[PDB]
Amino acid sequence: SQVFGVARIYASFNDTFVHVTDLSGKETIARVTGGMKVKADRDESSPYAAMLAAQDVAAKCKEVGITAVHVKIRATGGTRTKTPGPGGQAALRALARSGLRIGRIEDVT
Amino acid sequence: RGFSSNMSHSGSLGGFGTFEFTILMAALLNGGGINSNKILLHGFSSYQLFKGVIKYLATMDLCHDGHLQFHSNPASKYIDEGFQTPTLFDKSTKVNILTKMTVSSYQILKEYAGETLRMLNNVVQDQFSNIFLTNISRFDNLKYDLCYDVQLPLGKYNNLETSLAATFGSMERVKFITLENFLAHKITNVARYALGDRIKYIQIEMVGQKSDFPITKRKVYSNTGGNHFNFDFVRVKLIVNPSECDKLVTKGPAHSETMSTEAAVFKNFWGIKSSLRRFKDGSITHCCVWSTSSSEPIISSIVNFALQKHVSKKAQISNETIKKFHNFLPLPNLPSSAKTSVLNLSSFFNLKKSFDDLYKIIFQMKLPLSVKSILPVGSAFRYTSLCQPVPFAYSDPDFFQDVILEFETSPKWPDEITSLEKAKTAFLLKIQEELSANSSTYRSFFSRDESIPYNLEIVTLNILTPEGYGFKFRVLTERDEILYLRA
Amino acid sequence: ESSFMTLFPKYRESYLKTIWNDVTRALDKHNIACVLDLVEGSMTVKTTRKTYDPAIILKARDLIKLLARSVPFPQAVKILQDDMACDVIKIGNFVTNKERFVKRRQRLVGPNGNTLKALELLTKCYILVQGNTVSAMGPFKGLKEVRRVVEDCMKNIHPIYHIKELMIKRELAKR
Amino acid sequence: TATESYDIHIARETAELFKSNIFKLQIDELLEQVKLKQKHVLKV
Amino acid sequence: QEDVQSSIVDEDGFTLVV
Amino acid sequence: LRVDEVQGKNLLTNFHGMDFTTDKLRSMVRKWQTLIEANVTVKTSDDYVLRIFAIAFTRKQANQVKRHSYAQSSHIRAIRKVISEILTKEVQGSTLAQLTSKLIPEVINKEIENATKDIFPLQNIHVRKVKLLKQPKFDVGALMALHG
RNA sequence: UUAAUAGGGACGGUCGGGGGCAUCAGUAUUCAAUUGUCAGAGGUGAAAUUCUUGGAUUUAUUGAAGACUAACUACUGCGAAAGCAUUUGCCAAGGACGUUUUCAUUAAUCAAGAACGAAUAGGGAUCGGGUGGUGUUUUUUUAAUGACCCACU
C-alpha cells in the first residue's frame, strides 16, 4: 500500500545523526543533521534544534515520493555511554507530527 | 576418435594425425612454454610424455587465443595471439603444420583433449578401455547428438551460379581451390552463425567422398547426388548445448539509433525472421521468435531456413529419426502440449505448486505429535514419471505420489508393529478429521499398502486436490528399524 | 506492535505485586497494555492500537527497567514527563576481586551515604545504587557528570577530585 | 634449486605412481598385442 | 504391567549377552 | 537476503542469514541460571557451507525450594555434545528450500528437547543465528525452482 | 603384641573460572579498499586544538591487527599465596567422599637454609560426596540414566 524505507536515527552525544535510506540501506536520501541548523556549538544535540532538522528531513522525503518509513534508533554503544540522546525523541516526534507513517521500529545499539 | 592426417577442409574429420602428433611432441621436447620452458623431457615415460601432449592440447589454444612457434633447425615458444586458424608454425621451414585442420576440428580436438585430460586425472576408476579400446566413430548417432541429411543436386559447374546462393568466382578458386572446400567453409559459416550458442560443436561430412581413382583417369569422376562432385550428400553432425538449444528467441544485436554492421549481417541473414523485441529487462533488440514442438526441435528449423536461404534453394535437409524419437513420447493431455518443447517440465512444476499448497496447509496443523518432516519421494518429484502429470487424470498408476511423513521423536510409538501401524492409522484419522474439518476443497480417503510382505496394516492417506492431483501419505518412525531388525 | 519486557528479582516481587495497579494507572494514562508474569518474574509492556505517541514506550522500557532495579515508584514515574533523562550504570565489568568491588562501592557511597548524596547535590540527580548497578535520573548534563564520576570511581581514580571539582564548578556558576 | 624441483619430482612421482604402474602394465600388454613381426618387415 | 515385561526383556538381554 | 538475478523491475533474492532481536537476548538471560551456547560448521547437499549457532537456557520446575537451580558442569559437557549430533543429522540433506522450512516452526528445537529431557529439561532454546560463507556457484537454473 | 579420631600409601565413581600444551567462535575498535551520498564533523561550561569537497561524518560490503570472554558472575568454586571465567581435545596432578585394601609411631611444631611474590554448641543457608525412600517426574517405549524432594552423615 505504501513505499517504505528505514530512517535509522543515530542519537549520540553532542550531536544526533539521521539518514533515511532505502530498505537495502546502501542508498541514502536527504541526510541533513541537527548541528547544521544551529551555530553555537553547544546546542548541536538540543531537542529544539532536533525538531527543526527533522522537519527539513521530512520535507525532502515526501518531495521525492517516499511516503512511509521505519526507523532503527542507535546510541553510541560499544565502550561508550550506551544511552540514547535527548533529541532522539525529538527527531522521532517531529517527523511523526509531519505526517509520515510509522511501524515496528527497533534498536541497533 | 576418427582423427587422421587427411584433409579436414574437404568435409572430413582429420588434419591432425600421427605425423602431426610426432611433430607436436617433438616440438614439446624443445620447449613449448610461454617463456620457452620445456613442457616434456627426454627422460619421461610414455604416460608422462603423452600426458604432457594431452595436457598441452587441453590447456593451450592454437586457433583463436594463441599459436606455437618452433624451429625445425631455437626453443619452442608459445605466443598468445591466434590467427583465427589452427596454427603450429615452424620458423626454420616457415610451415604451419595444422593447415589441414579446420577450426571446429581443433575445438573438438581440444574438447577430447579435455575429456582425456580429465580421464587421466581420475585416480579411482579405469579409463584405459575408454581411451584406447572404445570406438566412438563407428556410429555418429552415438558420437554426435544430431545428424542432418542434406541433399544437394548441384549439377555441373555452369549450373552453380543458378544452384549456389553464394558466388563461386575466381577468388574462391584462388583461396578455396576446390568446390568442397568453399562448400564446407561456407556451410560451416552459415550454420555457425545460424545456431551460435544453441550447440557446442559441429562437423560437416561429405558422405561418399573418394580419394582413389585408377591410372586411366585424370581425377575422381562422379555423378551421384544430383551433381558431379565428390560426395553423395552432406551430413550435418551436431554437439548440442543443453542450456540454450530450445529457447524461443534466437538473440541478435541490440537495436540502437544507427544500424551497426552486426545488425545488417543479422537482418540480411534472417530477413523475414529478423525482428525487434522488448526483452524482459526493457532492451530493444533485433531477434528471432520461434515456436517449440513436441515432434521436433527448433534447430532443424534454423538449419533448414539457413541452408535453404543462404546455400542452395535445391537443398533437402531431413532428419526424421529424431522426429520419430520425439513422436514416440506419450503426448499428455495439456493445452499447447504439441507446441511444448521436450525440456519443459511445467506440469511437474504445477504438481509441485499444488503439493506446496498442500504442504503449507498440512504442515501448520496442530497435533499431539509435531510433524518432523513431509518429504516427497515421488517419481514426479524426481521427474521420471512415464506419463507427464495431467490434472484429474487419476487412471494412471503414477497419479498418487508417495510422501514420507515423520513426527517428532516421542516414546508414544508402541513396541508391536500392528499397533504401531494402527497408531499411524489413527494419526492419519486425526489428519483426515482436520482436513475434512477445514480444508474440504482437498478430498481424502484411506487405502492399504500390501506391497511390503506380511505387513497388511499399512494405510496410505490418499488426497485429491482441486488442482487434479493425488498423493498417498505414509509414515516412517524410528521404532520401525528396531522392530524389523529385532524381528 | 512493539513489545518491551524485562525481569525482576524476587525480593522486589511483593512490592511490585502491591503497586502494579498504580503501574497500570500511570501506564493507562498513555493507553498502553501491560502484563505481569509471576512464573517468569517479568513485566511486559506492549503497544496498543489506541496509542497517541508511540515513542513513550521507550520511556516505558526505562520505566520497567526502573522497576528492574528497585526504584521507588513515585520517584520512578518522573520518566513519563518530557523534561526527564535517565541512566542505568552497570558497574560489574571492572574488577574481578569482590573485595575491591566492595572497596569501590563503599568508596563511592562514602560513609553514611554522604558522598553519594553529595553527587545527588552536585549533579542534582536521583542516584540509587542497586548492587552491580547505579541508578541515575534527572538532567542530561547531570547524567554526563554522574556517568563520568562513577566510571572514574570504578577505576583507581579517587573521587575527591570530582567532589572538589564540581564544588569548584558550582561556585563558578554562582559568580 | 635442484633440491626443490627434486622434491616436486619425487612428490609428483608419489602422486602418479599408482596409475603409472598399473597403466604401465597396460602399456606392456597393449604393446605386446599391437607389435609388428619382423619377418613381414623383411618381407616388405 | 512393568515388572513382568522387565523380566521378559531381562531375558532378552540374557540372550543379548551370550 | 541476498540479491541474485533481475529481469526488468523483477529481482529475485536468496537467503543470506538468520538474525535475532536485541531486546530478547537482553531479556532472556535471567539472573541465577545457566547459559549454554553451541556452534558447528557443516557442508550441505549443494555445497553451501554454513556455521549454525544454538543457544540454550535452563528452566526451573514446580515446587522447587532453592532459588538458583544451576547445572552441574558435567551435564553441560554432555548436553553440548548431545545437541551436536542432532545438528548434523538434520543438515546435509535437502538444502534451504527444506532447511529454512524446518527452521520456521522450530521443529529442530523440539528435537533438542526430546533428547535433553533425560538429563535436565530446559527453557526457550533457539538457534538465534545462521550465516553463509562458502556458496560454490550461481546456479540460476536450480534457483528458478522456487519461482512461479 | 595391637593396628590410635597418630601418620603415610593403594583403588573406585568423581569434582574443580586448578595447571601445561593445542584448536576454535563472537562482536567491538582502528586502518585500507569499494558503494550510495555531499558541508560540516571532533571537542569543551563555552573557548581553543583536529579533520574535510582527492567527499570529512555516516551508510553497506570485505580483509587485517591486537585484545577479551558483557548479561549470567554469587559475600560461589579452586590454588600455599601470587592468582584462576569462549568451545573442544590431550597430558599428568590434587583433595574430599567411599573402603572389612596396605606399612606400623615411621610423628607434631620450628632459629639457620630453600622456592615463589613486589624484590562452648546449637539454628539456618549453601558447595562437594555418600546412604536410606509406606517418593515424585521425564516414561501411551520395553526398560532405564538424570533431575527433583524428605531424612541422615
> To the nearest 10°, the Cα dihedral for B26, B32, B36, B40?
-70
List of residues 6+ apart from B102 with CB closer than 8 A? B8, B9, B15, B86, B184, B188
Q: Phi and psi at residue A13, in whole multiples of 5°? A: -90, 150
Q: Which DSSP symbol is given to A35?
A: G
Chains D and C touch (3+ CB pairs under 8 A): no
Q: Does the A1-109 domain belong in CATH 3.30.420.80? A: yes
Chains that touch B (3 or more CB pairs under 8 A): D, F
Segments in chain C forming alpha helices (H)? 13-28, 56-68, 73-76, 98-109, 114-122, 140-153, 160-174
List of residues 6+ apart from C161 with CB closer than 8 A? none
C143: amino acid identity, one letter: L
CA C101 to C1' G121, in angstroms, rounded, equals 35
Residue B234 pairs with which residues in a beta bridge? B150, B206
Q: Are residues B176 and B104 part of one domain?
A: no
Q: Which helix (H) or strand (E) holds F11?
A: strand F11-14
Q: Phi and psi at residue C4, in whole multiples of 5°? A: -100, 135
Spatial distance between the Cα atoms of C116 and C113, rounded to a whole number of angstroms: 6
Q: Which helix (H) or strand (E) holds A73?
A: strand A72-73
Q: Are residues B298 and B171 part of one domain?
A: yes
Find the closest chain C residue to F62 by CA distance. C39
Domain span including residue F129: 1-148
User: B16 and B113 in contact (C-beta within 8 Å)?
Assistant: no
Kindly list the residues from chain C whose CB atom is less than 8 angstroms away from the CB atom of residue A104: 1-2
Closest residue by Cα to residue B303 from B193, B209, B217, B412: B193
- The grid coordinates listed for A43 are 546546542
Domain span including residue B297: 140-248+292-318
Task: Give B455: exposed, middle or buried? Use CB within 10 Å, 0-12, 13-18, 19+.
Answer: middle
| Strand spans (E) along B172-232 | 199-207
Spatial distance between the Cα atoms of C83 and C59, rounded to a whole number of angstroms: 12
Kindly list the residues from chain C whose CB atom is less than 8 angstroms away from the CB atom of residue F23: 4-5
B:D CB pairs within 8 Å: 16
Residues on chain A bordering chain C, Cβ-to-Cβ distance under 8 angstroms: 13, 73, 81, 83-84, 86, 89, 92-93, 96, 102-105
- The grid coordinates listed for B158 are 555452369
Based on its alpha-carbon atoms, the radius of gyration of chain D, rounded to whole angstroms, reads 18
Nearest 5°: CA angle at F87, between B476 and F106?
70
- The grid coordinates listed for B300 are 532443424
Asked if the Cβ–Cβ distance from C7 to F67 is below 8 Å, we say no
Q: Which helix (H) or strand (E) holds B479?
A: helix B479-486
Q: Phi and psi at residue C90, in whole multiples of 5°? A: -90, 115
Q: Are residues B241 and B163 part of one domain?
A: yes
Place of cell 542469514: F17
Segments in B250-365 forming alpha helices (H)? 261-270, 299-310, 320-327, 346-363
- Strand G: list positions under 7 Å from protein Cβ: 14-17, 25-26, 28-29, 35-48, 57-60, 70-76, 84-89, 125-129, 138-150
Asked if the Cβ–Cβ distance from B370 to F107 is below 8 Å, we say yes
Nearest 5°: CA angle at B467, between B462 and B470?
20
Segments in A17-103 forming alpha helices (H)? 47-62, 87-98
Closest residue by Cα to residue B424 from B397, B459, B472: B459
- The grid coordinates listed for C33 are 497494555
- For the residues of B40-108, what is the DSSP string, one character each? S-TT--HHHHHHHHHHHHHH--SSSS-EEEE-----BEEES---SS--EEESSS--BGGGG--HHHHHH
Residue A20 pairs with which residues in a beta bridge? A29
B307: amino acid identity, one letter: L
Closest residue by Cα to residue F122 from F55, F74, F67, F77: F55
User: What is the β-pairing status of strands B233-240 and B146-151?
Assistant: antiparallel
Is B346 near chain F, with CB under 8 Å? no
What distance in Å separates residue C55's CA from the closest CA in chain A?
Answer: 7
User: F48 and F2 in contact (C-beta within 8 Å)?
Assistant: no
List of residues 6+ apart from C26 with CB closer than 8 A? C77, C80
Asked if the Cβ–Cβ distance from A96 to C55 is below 8 Å, we say yes
- D21 to B44, B45, D24: CA distances (angstroms): 14, 11, 5
CA A55 to C1' G71, in angstroms, rounded, equals 38
Task: Give C60: exposed, middle or buried? Use CB within 10 Å, 0-12, 13-18, 19+.
Answer: buried
F138: amino acid identity, one letter: F
User: B136 and B203 in contact (C-beta within 8 Å)?
Assistant: no
Place of cell 604401465: D24
Based on its alpha-carbon atoms, the radius of gyration of chain B, rounded to whole angstroms, reads 31
What distance in Å separates residue C43's CA from the closest CA in chain F?
Answer: 10
Q: Which DSSP symbol is given to F126?
A: B
Spatial distance between the Cα atoms of C160 and C115, rounded to a whole number of angstroms: 9
Residues 420-459 of B with CB under 8 A from F: none
Would you put residue B285 in left (φ > 0), alpha (ψ -120 to 50) or beta? beta
Spatial distance between the Cα atoms of B224 and B205, rounded to a whole number of angstroms: 16
Structurally, chain F folds into a number of domains equal to 1
Spatial distance between the Cα atoms of B471 and B267, rounded to a whole number of angstroms: 52
Spatial distance between the Cα atoms of B384 and B393, rounded to a whole number of angstroms: 17
Three-state DSSP class for residue B204: strand
User: What is the β-pairing status of strands B88-90 and B67-70?
Assistant: parallel
Three-state DSSP class for residue B397: coil
Q: Which DSSP symbol is given to B224?
A: G
Find the closest chain B residue to D15 by CA distance. B123
Kindly list the residues from chain F whose CB atom is less than 8 angstroms away from the CB atom of residue A106: 21-22
Residues on chain A bordering chain F, Cβ-to-Cβ distance under 8 angstroms: 106-109
Residue B405 pairs with which residues in a beta bridge? B374, B475
SS3 content of chain A, % helix, strand, coil (to 5): 30, 15, 55
Residue B74 pairs with which residues in a beta bridge? none
Spatial distance between the Cα atoms of B309 and B269, rounded to a whole number of angstroms: 8
Spatial distance between the Cα atoms of B311 and C126, rounded to a whole number of angstroms: 97
Spatial distance between the Cα atoms of A8 and A31, rounded to a whole number of angstroms: 10
Spatial distance between the Cα atoms of B422 and B414, rounded to a whole number of angstroms: 10
The upper half-sphere exposure of residue B353, i.e. CA atoms within 13 Å in the direction of its Cβ, equals 15
User: F78 and F120 in contact (C-beta within 8 Å)?
Assistant: no
Residues 108-137 of F with CB under 8 A from B: 110-111, 114-115
What distance in Å separates residue A92's CA from the closest CA in chain F?
Answer: 20
Question: How many other CB atoms are found less than 10 A from the CB of residue B152?
Answer: 25
F110: amino acid identity, one letter: K
Residues on chain D bordering chain B, Cβ-to-Cβ distance under 8 angstroms: 16, 18-20, 22-24, 26-27, 30
Asked if the Cβ–Cβ distance from D19 to B46 is below 8 Å, we say no
Chains that touch F (3 or more CB pairs under 8 A): A, B, C
Q: Which DSSP symbol is given to B10?
A: G
Asked if the Cβ–Cβ distance from C4 to F23 is below 8 Å, we say yes
Three-state DSSP class for residue F54: strand
Return the sign of the alpha-carbon dihedral for residues C142, C148, C151, C153. negative
Spatial distance between the Cα atoms of B58 and B114, rounded to a whole number of angstroms: 5
Spatial distance between the Cα atoms of B9 and B242, rounded to a whole number of angstroms: 28
B318: amino acid identity, one letter: S
Is B47 near chain D, with CB under 8 Å? yes
Query: Which nucleotide across the nucleic acid strands is nearest to F34, CA versus C1'?
Result: G72
Spatial distance between the Cα atoms of A77 and A81, rounded to a whole number of angstroms: 6
- The grid coordinates listed for D14 are 608419489
B437: amino acid identity, one letter: A
CA F131 to C1' G83, in angstroms, rounded, equals 39
SS (H, E, C) chain D: CHHHHHHHHHHHHHHHHHHHHHHHHHHHHHHHHCCCCHHHHHHC
Would you put residue C110 in left (φ > 0), alpha (ψ -120 to 50) or beta? left
Domain CATH code at residue B82: 1.10.1410.10
SS (H, E, C) B239-264: EECCCCCCCCEEEEEECCCCCCHHHH
Q: Which DSSP symbol is given to F57?
A: E
Asked if the Cβ–Cβ distance from B47 to D30 is below 8 Å, we say no
Closest residue by Cα to residue B460 from B350, B414, B451, B469: B451
Based on its alpha-carbon atoms, the radius of gyration of chain E, rounded to whole angstroms, reads 8
List of residues 6+ apart from B71 with CB closer than 8 A? B30, B90, B91, B92
The upper half-sphere exposure of residue B143, i.e. CA atoms within 13 Å in the direction of its Cβ, equals 18
List of residues 6+ apart from C58 with CB closer than 8 A? A73, A84, A89, C4
Question: How many other CB atoms are found less than 10 A from the CB of residue C160?
Answer: 10
CA F107 to C1' G147, in angstroms, rounded, equals 24
Segments in B311-345 forming alpha helices (H)? 320-327
List of residues 6+ apart from B418 with CB closer than 8 A? B457
- Method used to solve the structure: cryo-EM
